[PDB]
Design an enzyme around this catalytic site. Sequence first.
Site, mmCIF file in Angstrom:
data_model
loop_
_atom_site.group_PDB
_atom_site.id
_atom_site.type_symbol
_atom_site.label_atom_id
_atom_site.label_comp_id
_atom_site.label_asym_id
_atom_site.label_seq_id
_atom_site.Cartn_x
_atom_site.Cartn_y
_atom_site.Cartn_z
ATOM 1 N N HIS A 110 0.798 -1.215 0.000
ATOM 2 C CA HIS A 110 0.000 0.000 0.000
ATOM 3 C C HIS A 110 0.836 1.273 0.000
ATOM 4 N N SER A 169 -0.218 -1.101 -6.616
ATOM 5 C CA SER A 169 0.054 -2.276 -7.422
ATOM 6 C C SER A 169 0.494 -1.907 -8.830
ATOM 7 N N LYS A 202 -15.323 -8.061 -8.011
ATOM 8 C CA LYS A 202 -14.349 -8.775 -8.833
ATOM 9 C C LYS A 202 -13.616 -9.837 -8.024
ATOM 10 N N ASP A 203 -13.336 -9.555 -6.751
ATOM 11 C CA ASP A 203 -12.779 -10.581 -5.881
ATOM 12 C C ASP A 203 -13.821 -11.628 -5.515
ATOM 13 N N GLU A 225 3.523 -34.661 0.158
ATOM 14 C CA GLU A 225 2.412 -34.070 -0.567
ATOM 15 C C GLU A 225 2.917 -33.398 -1.843
HETATM 16 C C1 HEC Z 1 7.115 -14.851 -3.224
HETATM 17 C C2 HEC Z 1 6.189 -13.918 -3.450
HETATM 18 C C3 HEC Z 1 4.823 -13.780 -2.734
HETATM 19 C C4 HEC Z 1 4.133 -14.609 -1.925
HETATM 20 C C5 HEC Z 1 4.416 -16.044 -1.432
HETATM 21 C C6 HEC Z 1 2.919 -13.945 -1.537
HETATM 22 N N1 HEC Z 1 2.896 -12.699 -2.113
HETATM 23 FE FE1 HEC Z 1 1.240 -11.542 -2.290
HETATM 24 N N2 HEC Z 1 2.241 -10.280 -3.536
HETATM 25 C C7 HEC Z 1 3.551 -10.432 -3.937
HETATM 26 C C8 HEC Z 1 3.874 -9.332 -4.811
HETATM 27 C C9 HEC Z 1 5.235 -9.097 -5.498
HETATM 28 C C10 HEC Z 1 2.797 -8.558 -4.920
HETATM 29 C C11 HEC Z 1 2.692 -7.274 -5.762
HETATM 30 C C12 HEC Z 1 2.136 -7.650 -7.128
HETATM 31 C C13 HEC Z 1 1.952 -6.444 -8.005
HETATM 32 O O1 HEC Z 1 1.425 -5.416 -7.521
HETATM 33 O O2 HEC Z 1 2.340 -6.512 -9.194
HETATM 34 C C14 HEC Z 1 1.743 -9.135 -4.122
HETATM 35 C C15 HEC Z 1 0.468 -8.641 -3.965
HETATM 36 C C16 HEC Z 1 -0.430 -9.094 -3.022
HETATM 37 C C17 HEC Z 1 -1.779 -8.622 -2.785
HETATM 38 C C18 HEC Z 1 -2.512 -7.502 -3.543
HETATM 39 C C19 HEC Z 1 -3.448 -8.102 -4.590
HETATM 40 C C20 HEC Z 1 -2.713 -9.000 -5.540
HETATM 41 O O3 HEC Z 1 -2.967 -10.227 -5.529
HETATM 42 O O4 HEC Z 1 -1.880 -8.481 -6.316
HETATM 43 C C21 HEC Z 1 -2.289 -9.334 -1.784
HETATM 44 C C22 HEC Z 1 -3.680 -9.223 -1.141
HETATM 45 C C23 HEC Z 1 -1.309 -10.279 -1.353
HETATM 46 N N3 HEC Z 1 -0.184 -10.113 -2.124
HETATM 47 C C24 HEC Z 1 -1.501 -11.175 -0.338
HETATM 48 C C25 HEC Z 1 -0.752 -12.300 -0.135
HETATM 49 C C26 HEC Z 1 -1.049 -13.338 0.817
HETATM 50 C C27 HEC Z 1 -2.288 -13.266 1.732
HETATM 51 C C28 HEC Z 1 -0.082 -14.268 0.714
HETATM 52 C C29 HEC Z 1 0.164 -15.607 1.455
HETATM 53 C C30 HEC Z 1 -0.585 -16.169 2.407
HETATM 54 C C31 HEC Z 1 0.834 -13.817 -0.307
HETATM 55 N N4 HEC Z 1 0.400 -12.616 -0.808
HETATM 56 C C32 HEC Z 1 1.956 -14.478 -0.723
HETATM 57 C C33 HEC Z 1 4.400 -11.451 -3.575
HETATM 58 C C34 HEC Z 1 4.052 -12.562 -2.845
HETATM 59 C C1 LIG Z 2 8.304 -37.934 2.229
HETATM 60 O O1 LIG Z 2 9.116 -37.103 3.043
HETATM 61 C C2 LIG Z 2 9.041 -35.776 2.874
HETATM 62 C C3 LIG Z 2 8.193 -34.999 3.568
HETATM 63 O O2 LIG Z 2 7.333 -35.483 4.484
HETATM 64 C C4 LIG Z 2 5.983 -35.744 4.096
HETATM 65 C C5 LIG Z 2 8.192 -33.529 3.341
HETATM 66 O O3 LIG Z 2 7.434 -32.815 3.944
HETATM 67 C C6 LIG Z 2 9.126 -32.932 2.359
HETATM 68 C C7 LIG Z 2 9.031 -31.446 2.216
HETATM 69 C C8 LIG Z 2 9.865 -30.726 3.226
HETATM 70 C C9 LIG Z 2 10.836 -29.874 2.928
HETATM 71 C C10 LIG Z 2 11.234 -29.518 1.533
HETATM 72 C C11 LIG Z 2 11.614 -29.197 4.016
HETATM 73 C C12 LIG Z 2 10.710 -28.455 5.007
HETATM 74 C C13 LIG Z 2 11.451 -27.306 5.607
HETATM 75 C C14 LIG Z 2 12.100 -27.270 6.769
HETATM 76 C C15 LIG Z 2 12.825 -26.069 7.300
HETATM 77 C C16 LIG Z 2 12.127 -28.505 7.630
HETATM 78 C C17 LIG Z 2 11.150 -28.447 8.810
HETATM 79 C C18 LIG Z 2 11.883 -28.160 10.081
HETATM 80 C C19 LIG Z 2 11.583 -28.586 11.304
HETATM 81 C C20 LIG Z 2 10.414 -29.464 11.621
HETATM 82 C C21 LIG Z 2 12.453 -28.193 12.465
HETATM 83 C C22 LIG Z 2 11.674 -27.901 13.756
HETATM 84 C C23 LIG Z 2 11.002 -26.568 13.721
HETATM 85 C C24 LIG Z 2 9.712 -26.345 13.940
HETATM 86 C C25 LIG Z 2 8.734 -27.435 14.257
HETATM 87 C C26 LIG Z 2 9.142 -24.954 13.879
HETATM 88 C C27 LIG Z 2 10.191 -23.844 14.033
HETATM 89 C C28 LIG Z 2 9.590 -22.586 14.573
HETATM 90 C C29 LIG Z 2 9.611 -21.372 14.017
HETATM 91 C C30 LIG Z 2 10.264 -21.056 12.704
HETATM 92 C C31 LIG Z 2 8.961 -20.195 14.690
HETATM 93 C C32 LIG Z 2 9.959 -33.702 1.662
HETATM 94 C C33 LIG Z 2 10.925 -33.164 0.665
HETATM 95 C C34 LIG Z 2 9.972 -35.174 1.884
HETATM 96 O O4 LIG Z 2 10.736 -35.890 1.278
HETATM 97 C C1 LIG Z 3 -4.353 -4.928 -6.296
HETATM 98 O O1 LIG Z 3 -5.541 -4.542 -5.620
HETATM 99 C C2 LIG Z 3 -5.831 -5.244 -4.520
HETATM 100 C C3 LIG Z 3 -6.459 -6.427 -4.556
HETATM 101 O O2 LIG Z 3 -6.819 -7.019 -5.708
HETATM 102 C C4 LIG Z 3 -8.057 -6.625 -6.292
HETATM 103 C C5 LIG Z 3 -6.757 -7.166 -3.300
HETATM 104 O O3 LIG Z 3 -7.317 -8.233 -3.411
HETATM 105 C C6 LIG Z 3 -6.374 -6.549 -1.989
HETATM 106 C C7 LIG Z 3 -6.628 -7.228 -0.666
HETATM 107 C C8 LIG Z 3 -7.898 -7.962 -0.397
HETATM 108 C C9 LIG Z 3 -8.409 -8.089 0.823
HETATM 109 C C10 LIG Z 3 -7.791 -7.488 2.049
HETATM 110 C C11 LIG Z 3 -9.675 -8.867 1.026
HETATM 111 C C12 LIG Z 3 -9.380 -10.375 1.022
HETATM 112 C C13 LIG Z 3 -9.438 -10.969 2.390
HETATM 113 C C14 LIG Z 3 -8.453 -11.230 3.251
HETATM 114 C C15 LIG Z 3 -6.995 -10.963 3.016
HETATM 115 C C16 LIG Z 3 -8.801 -11.843 4.577
HETATM 116 C C17 LIG Z 3 -9.937 -12.866 4.453
HETATM 117 C C18 LIG Z 3 -10.898 -12.751 5.593
HETATM 118 C C19 LIG Z 3 -12.186 -13.093 5.590
HETATM 119 C C20 LIG Z 3 -12.909 -13.668 4.405
HETATM 120 C C21 LIG Z 3 -13.024 -12.914 6.826
HETATM 121 C C22 LIG Z 3 -12.232 -13.085 8.132
HETATM 122 C C23 LIG Z 3 -13.137 -12.893 9.308
HETATM 123 C C24 LIG Z 3 -12.824 -12.691 10.589
HETATM 124 C C25 LIG Z 3 -13.848 -12.510 11.671
HETATM 125 C C26 LIG Z 3 -11.380 -12.644 11.021
HETATM 126 C C27 LIG Z 3 -10.972 -11.362 11.768
HETATM 127 C C28 LIG Z 3 -10.750 -11.614 13.229
HETATM 128 C C29 LIG Z 3 -11.101 -10.841 14.262
HETATM 129 C C30 LIG Z 3 -11.804 -9.533 14.039
HETATM 130 C C31 LIG Z 3 -10.844 -11.161 15.704
HETATM 131 C C32 LIG Z 3 -5.745 -5.370 -1.978
HETATM 132 C C33 LIG Z 3 -5.315 -4.677 -0.733
HETATM 133 C C34 LIG Z 3 -5.443 -4.644 -3.228
HETATM 134 O O4 LIG Z 3 -4.885 -3.568 -3.203
#
Ligand code: HEC
Ligand SMILES: COC1=C(OC)C(=O)C(C/C=C(\C)CC/C=C(/C)CC/C=C(\C)CC/C=C(\C)CCC=C(C)C)=C(C)C1=O
Ligand SMILES: COC1=C(OC)C(=O)C(C/C=C(\C)CC/C=C(\C)CC/C=C(\C)CC/C=C(/C)CCC=C(C)C)=C(C)C1=O
Lengths: 50, 59, 376, 376, 122, 70, 52, 48, 48
Positions: free
Chosen positions: C201, C205, C227-228, C271
């Site tokens: 923000h 975008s 649209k979303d 997976e």
């Molecule tokens: C490795 C890259 C990557 C990951 C993973 C990623 N984002 Fe994005 N995201 C981006 C980038 C870069 C943009 C900006 C895109 C643009 O404006 O061209 C973006 C844009 C967005 C936007 C604005 C709308 C859109 O889709 O462009 C939202 C919302 C968003 N990200 C949410 C998320 C959420 C929620 C997750 C995961 C739970 C996530 N992103 C994971 C890179 C990432």
């Molecule tokens: C059949 O076999 C296999 C799996 O199994 C079903 C797999 O999934 C994966 C996929 C896993 C990959 C690629 C690696 C995942 C990444 C990391 C860093 C390993 C996970 C690390 C752990 C569990 C260390 C302990 C840490 C924990 C629990 C959390 C740490 C806390 C914070 C960061 C706040 C592969 C390749 C695999 O061949």
């Molecule tokens: C490029 O333009 C853009 C878009 O593309 C058109 C986008 O999409 C978005 C972002 C879209 C948003 C924030 C809406 C999508 C929803 C999200 C990330 C969260 C989903 C939550 C839901 C459905 C409800 C959750 C409900 C509750 C009660 C949880 C909250 C908890 C408490 C209050 C305790 C942005 C900012 C944008 O700029």
Amino acid sequence: SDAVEVFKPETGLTPTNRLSMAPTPYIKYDEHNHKRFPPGTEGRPFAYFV
Amino acid sequence: VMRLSEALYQTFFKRSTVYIPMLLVGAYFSNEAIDYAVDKMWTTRNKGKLFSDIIAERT
Amino acid sequence: RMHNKIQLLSVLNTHLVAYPTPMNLNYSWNGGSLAGMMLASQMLTGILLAMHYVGHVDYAFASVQHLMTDVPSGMILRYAHANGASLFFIVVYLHVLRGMYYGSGAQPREIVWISGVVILLVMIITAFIGYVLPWGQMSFWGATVITSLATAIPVVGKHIMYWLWGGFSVDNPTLNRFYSFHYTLPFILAGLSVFHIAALHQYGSTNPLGVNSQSSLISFGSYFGAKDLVGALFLALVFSILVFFYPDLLGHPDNLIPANPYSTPQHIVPEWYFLWVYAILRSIPNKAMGVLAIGLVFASLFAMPFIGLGGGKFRIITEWLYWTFLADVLLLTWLGGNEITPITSFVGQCCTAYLFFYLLVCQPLVGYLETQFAHG
Amino acid sequence: RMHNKIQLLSVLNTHLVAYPTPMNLNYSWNGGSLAGMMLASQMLTGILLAMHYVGHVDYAFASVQHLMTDVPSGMILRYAHANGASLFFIVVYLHVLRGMYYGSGAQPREIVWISGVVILLVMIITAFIGYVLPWGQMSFWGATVITSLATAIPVVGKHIMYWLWGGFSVDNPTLNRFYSFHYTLPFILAGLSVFHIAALHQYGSTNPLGVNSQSSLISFGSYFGAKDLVGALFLALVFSILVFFYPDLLGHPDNLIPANPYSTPQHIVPEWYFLWVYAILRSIPNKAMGVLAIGLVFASLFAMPFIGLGGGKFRIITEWLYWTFLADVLLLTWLGGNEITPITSFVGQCCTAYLFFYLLVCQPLVGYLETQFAHG
Amino acid sequence: TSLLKQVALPVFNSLATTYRSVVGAKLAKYGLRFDDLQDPLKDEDVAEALRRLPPDVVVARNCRLRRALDLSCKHEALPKDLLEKQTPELSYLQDVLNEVRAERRERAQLGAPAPYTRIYYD
Amino acid sequence: RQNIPLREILYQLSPYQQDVIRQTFTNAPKTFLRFFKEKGVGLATFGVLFFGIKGYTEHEMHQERLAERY
Amino acid sequence: LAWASYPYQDEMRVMGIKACLMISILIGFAAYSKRLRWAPIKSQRIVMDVVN
Amino acid sequence: PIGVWSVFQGYVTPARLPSIQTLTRVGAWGGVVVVGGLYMVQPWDWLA
Amino acid sequence: PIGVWSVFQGYVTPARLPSIQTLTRVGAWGGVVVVGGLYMVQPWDWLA
Ligand code: HEC
Ligand SMILES: COC1=C(OC)C(=O)C(C/C=C(\C)CC/C=C(/C)CC/C=C(\C)CC/C=C(\C)CCC=C(C)C)=C(C)C1=O
Ligand SMILES: COC1=C(OC)C(=O)C(C/C=C(\C)CC/C=C(\C)CC/C=C(\C)CC/C=C(/C)CCC=C(C)C)=C(C)C1=O
Ligand SMILES: CCCCCCCCCCCCCCCCCC(=O)OC[C@H](COP(=O)(O)O)OC(=O)CCCCCCCCCCCCCCCCC
Ligand SMILES: CCCCCCCCCCCCCCCCCC(=O)OC[C@H](COP(=O)(O)O)OC(=O)CCCCCCCCCCCCCCCCC
Ligand code: HEC
Ligand code: HEC
Ligand code: HEC
Ligand SMILES: COC1=C(OC)C(=O)C(C/C=C(\C)CC/C=C(/C)CC/C=C(\C)CC/C=C(\C)CCC=C(C)C)=C(C)C1=O
Ligand SMILES: COC1=C(OC)C(=O)C(C/C=C(\C)CC/C=C(/C)CC/C=C(\C)CC/C=C(\C)CCC=C(C)C)=C(C)C1=O
């Protein structure tokens, strides 16, 4: 630039105006909480060691 | 009145990369001294009641 | 204005109602809102699931079965939480590929890309340790194979491994700590998502044309809500199909067997969303080199805003090379589910080499050539 | 200059380093930082304890014991969690009493007071469901007595009670859902605390003089970091004493007996921080009227920024009545721990009536008279 | 009520004078006045009354508040020679504030609002 | 950031040109007496009300226990 | 039986003695560093034209 | 202050209070809450 | 255009690069992390 056109002070011999025209080198700080060292005390402070 | 020395300032205080290892060695020795004092006081007060006193008594 | 008197309403208005958005965004800009919806769905289903799951060996499998057959709506909750991880990874992968196609991480949106890569790493760890929780054969043996890969770091190996396990093998302490870590990590995901959206923000975008769009901006809350909603309804259709008609299609049948530490399955594969990293690891005939290559992929992902030149259309050579990269990644995903064979080893090595070649040679050098062709 | 280039540096600098703060704040303005530190301590020690606790009625008490004896540093973590809950409630209660003394909820800080009352309600629910997790005699029987207050609601009381229990009695599904809700609600507390603090930063803090302080403001990070460190160390001393020398001082011995649904204790009492609400409930010989009285107490707490007049030192009649209010709430705390008796029933009724009189009669009317005395 | 409310006013006046004596003894050590105890953030009429004032009155009010806050930080009181000169009941704001509140009461009987709001920041 | 009109001269000394904790021993008894002088009335009325009502309640509870005896 | 209820009472008390000693020293050091930072403010001189 | 200070300062007048038509149209939301609760729970024998 | 674009354009000269003294002062942080790790782990007399 002149202070009358930039700072625009009030006219008179108020306590702030007296120090503005001629500041004194005998500055008195408050010493109820901390007593000052003698002025001009040199050397790296002892508080780093503490 | 009391003031840190200049030559001692230029060695252990002017750079953080020299200050930090000195800090760590001082921390190590402070922990050792506190451990020693606490353990000595505890063992002196509770003499004859610990398990090691019974084991050394049975030798 | 009513929103000008309460500071909560001012922030919500500014960032969700009146936020200026380019008017020519197509349907490939709906990845982020879908990813947020999937994160919220996973959090809700899991919090509901944790009221019937017991995180102990000799109770975990039976608690999942009691959840499936005895809890009202429990089968829907479990199948939704299982397939929602797959749909979450589908959406996030398509989001990343969009950013790769358009050069979305470039200046001034490098923080957005970096926070995205951090989010992806936390998502991977969360999904893996959550996959361990049902305590089947695939759960136990995947957790065994992955966590016993810290014996590649010299000297400090099995010490870290035994500290992770809480013992000498994957057992009840490993499952018990994996439950706590898996419950906790999605809140870090939600906070990182909020920070990630807040970083975008600052500058807004990009657009499909790849030009400056400050002259043509419209309000978010009216035009990009429906649209979303359309894309969310498509995702809900796919989600409902996966839950109700093919609930075990994306899984593995071996995870319905209770875990046996003395008998191993014939094929141990993770997976599907972990399969490309598994293929990269399994292709290289050295454990330390495989872990180094896996780390190098993510390092090159972090370095992408500072080395990657070239965006969408009007930069046509890198645009064409994107499709070779997509084919390479999908090939690595296919190879991870196969057996180790000399031809598959050779093909996986070639695919890993081309992945590094595209990420580190094509994106800077071909992009610089495109800039010299277009504006030189 | 460097914090001008990144958003996250700018927000942190503005709200933590260079935030203006009244120079005459005394040590009564340290309760908020201490409450935040105690929330962080509770979250850390709880996350660490969750790796060894099992939420099943056959393994909960046994896993608590195993964590106490066999897990390295497990006794420190368990005692730290159980006594950090009490220190959390001490710090929050002193924070609220500071706000009541100075009238800090007044305009323009109504949102801060309302979010505070919301935080306190969430805190109460979090601690109550956390106490059930050891599955001792007090843990079982207090959950039985308190969740049986839903039957005071006519027609649909027993249905809500059975829906919350998951059965016809407090049993294993109650413990499992309580564990999930208890893991979840601290993160809502962290979010509420972030919102509560960001609401205060709109206008700043009040000072002990009760006057406008915009002429005398100093940076928060350089000056109040050390002043908060001093209070944190005084809290760490009390925490160390409670953890290591008197670990069961603020507990109950009956929670070390395993839960028995066929033999109740002779004196079912809560933790000390719920004793004033319990005394309010026990003083009234009608369950619906007791629940209504508790709800009216919390409604009067919500309505404080709009009915309350009267603040700090220079408003002397309400300043004198504050100490009578404090004596009343401590008498309510003491009365909750005692058995039902005609004199304790009478004294509890009088104390509840005085609490209502102070909240709803003294604060508007006496505040208005002293405003007319001072400025009429 | 009118039979007992004729002489209920001198008792009010006596209590008010005792209250002002005690509080003005408390206020004079900080160098404050009774009108300095009114916050423009706490009341929008006080914020309106404060911008109707000449600049030197506002400068004096800010100076007194700064001195009192410095004294509160230092845990001090005024010295005896300054403390004997303090006039805690010398009003500078009550006439303007009374006019502002009368105007607001007049507008409210005709359904009109006040032509100002609360101080809103950010 | 909220311009405040004010006329003053402010002086400040370096924290390495004065002492840190030496005056804390001199002012400690005076601050103790000043604290109790300022908060004496409130602490006293709190103590009187709390301990008087608690003592009356405990006395009447003991009388209630004695009345149940045979 | 008193040992059985609290098997680590001796170790807890030794750790508590060390913790209380360390925190008591750190309270004095933190009070020193608090008063050093606040010293230019606690001893400042303000002169104004207001007498009242 | 805005709650009881406004009543005590004489700022709450009949000319400043909302009209009876406004109170009728605002209070009509009570039937919406009743029918929403009946739609959520469906606790009726009303369908016959 | 921060990164490889800076070196393609000729913006990274012998000047605007850090000096030897700057690199040594930054390079002196290598001993601090080593001493901190040895302080945290304490593998005493572990050097072969
Ligand atoms: C490795 C890259 C990557 C990951 C993973 C990623 N984002 Fe994005 N995201 C981006 C980038 C870069 C943009 C900006 C895109 C643009 O404006 O061209 C973006 C844009 C967005 C936007 C604005 C709308 C859109 O889709 O462009 C939202 C919302 C968003 N990200 C949410 C998320 C959420 C929620 C997750 C995961 C739970 C996530 N992103 C994971 C890179 C990432
Ligand atoms: C059949 O076999 C296999 C799996 O199994 C079903 C797999 O999934 C994966 C996929 C896993 C990959 C690629 C690696 C995942 C990444 C990391 C860093 C390993 C996970 C690390 C752990 C569990 C260390 C302990 C840490 C924990 C629990 C959390 C740490 C806390 C914070 C960061 C706040 C592969 C390749 C695999 O061949
Ligand atoms: C490029 O333009 C853009 C878009 O593309 C058109 C986008 O999409 C978005 C972002 C879209 C948003 C924030 C809406 C999508 C929803 C999200 C990330 C969260 C989903 C939550 C839901 C459905 C409800 C959750 C409900 C509750 C009660 C949880 C909250 C908890 C408490 C209050 C305790 C942005 C900012 C944008 O700029
Ligand atoms: C806004 C609403 C405010 C509500 C205010 C609620 C009360 C807040 C303050 C309460 C003070 C603490 C009392 C806790 C114990 C009550 C016990 C009770 O009444 O039942 C007796 C109860 C049962 O007696 P029986 O049932 O009558 O035989 O006895 C016990 O359980 C043992 C009591 C032990 C008392 C320990 C006292 C010292 C603990 C540490 C004190 C720390 C002070 C602050 C230091 C840190 C500063 C940051
Ligand atoms: C039968 C059972 C026997 C039980 C015996 C043990 C009972 C509890 C122990 C004794 C408690 C009595 C002395 C408590 C002193 C505590 C300290 C204190 O009050 O100082 C605070 C406080 C300190 O003020 P500060 O130093 O300014 O904070 O002191 C006072 O202000 C004085 C308080 C006096 C008011 C309480 C007097 C005792 C109440 C007894 C009422 C009896 C009614 C009888 C009616 C029936 C007659 C037929
Ligand atoms: C008051 C606020 C409070 C907060 C915040 C809190 N807890 Fe606790 N928790 C308690 C109480 C009270 C108990 C009961 C302790 C006892 O009596 O044994 C408890 C006990 C537990 C237990 C059972 C183990 C035991 O010793 O009985 C677990 C597991 C737990 N908490 C997890 C958590 C987690 C995870 C978090 C945060 C993410 C958390 N708690 C935060 C109050 C809290
Ligand atoms: C990024 C993916 C992801 C997120 C986010 C996620 N989970 Fe899951 N979780 C999984 C996967 C995959 C499984 C394995 C499901 C299976 O195969 O049965 C799982 C399993 C579980 C289980 C074991 C019961 C079962 O049916 O497997 C629980 C309990 C659980 N998750 C709770 C949660 C909670 C609680 C949250 C959030 C607060 C959460 N999950 C968020 C991926 C995730
Ligand atoms: C019911 C009231 C209430 C509760 C509960 C409450 N707050 Fe406060 N808090 C306030 C008010 C009112 C203020 C403003 C007081 C002032 O600045 O004079 C405040 C101020 C603060 C401050 C700034 C400095 C201070 O200590 O006054 C912090 C930090 C803070 N709150 C944090 C917290 C945290 C963390 C929690 C609980 C987890 C909490 N508060 C609970 C009402 C509350
Ligand atoms: C003048 O007034 C003020 C104060 O008073 C003197 C203050 O003190 C502060 C500073 C506030 C503090 C120290 C309170 C702490 C703040 C909050 C919001 C408490 C809740 C936060 C928690 C529990 C964080 C823990 C959670 C984490 C880290 C997320 C999980 C992730 C991982 C474990 C990796 C400020 C700004 C202030 O203006
Ligand atoms: C030993 O034991 C005991 C306790 O314990 C430590 C107690 O506290 C109490 C008494 C406490 C009172 C009267 C104050 C706290 C009161 C209530 C009602 C706590 C709130 C908790 C409820 C209603 C349980 C229901 C849980 C929910 C709804 C989970 C939250 C989730 C969502 C809102 C989505 C008693 C008597 C007790 O003998």
